[PDB]
């Protein structure tokens, strides 16, 4: 089997991407944030505290003839940005782009943090990291991809995120028309439950490529590119007037600036992020100071190849017995 679904930016800045997902019988379609940095499929629901729902579409398990309460199961998650959610668990039929999994754990939110309430466009998350990170207790549950894998034509999914435009998540096949050149594959460590890999270096604009190992995670659920402070300082030094602002919480730059590209290495291959992918617009409405899309990871504990980086590539998440990642230009 295969599946293919369009993923759409939630706003004009590409702050996140939403993908329609069919849950239950009859189908209830919710727009979920596909997140290769986490491993829970959770949704706003008829059980979510009413004051914490503000425009989201909800899953109502009582209206699904295939929903079954997973007795005794609860979940609770906290994300790297400080947001969180928790609740109980159903199993139900879940379909993405024509690919159907029966008995998928659907984690129904009883509580969500304010950042989720305030984002009316995201109805939940669909985790695509390794199932070892799933938070369901006392019996950990499998991700959608883990449940689908054995049925897929090939045990892979691909992320093709657009810049200011829709893109595609495919399951079970590699669309050879969706990229240019070849796909370069690179080793993955699953020891932390992430799609963790080592970039071979970087360049700023037309500058020379610096060969240096940068360990980080491929994370579709993170907006920005978080890299070591040395790398990030080298980037922003090429933007007149850019500075790190403690009050704003990262590098800002004059909105009148032209941003240089940023290149990252995948083996001997190179992925070029155009400068305009690094512009996240005014820090507040009407400001002439703009927020940068490349930020320091120093306060995180891990480097994160988020959407800024991933949207410049066609990315293969190869879930074979020994997982690997592939990157192609497009």
From Swiss-Prot:
Disulfide bonds listed in the record: 255-290
Active site: 35, 199
GO terms (BP aspect): proteolysis
Keywords tagged on the record: Aspartyl protease, Disulfide bond, Hydrolase, Protease, Signal, Zymogen
Top-level taxon of origin: Eukaryota
The EC number(s) this enzyme carries: 3.4.23.22
Record field: catalytic activity: Hydrolysis of proteins with specificity similar to that of pepsin A, prefers hydrophobic residues at P1 and P1', but does not cleave 14-Ala-|-Leu-15 in the B chain of insulin or Z-Glu-Tyr. Clots milk
Every Peptidase A1 domain range: 17-328
GO molecular function: aspartic-type endopeptidase activity
Protein family (similarity comment): Belongs to the peptidase A1 family.
Listed name of the protein: Endothiapepsin
Organism: Cryphonectria parasitica (Chestnut blight fungus)
Lineage: Eukaryota, Fungi, Dikarya, Ascomycota, Pezizomycotina
First and last residues shown, out of full length: 90 to 419 of 419
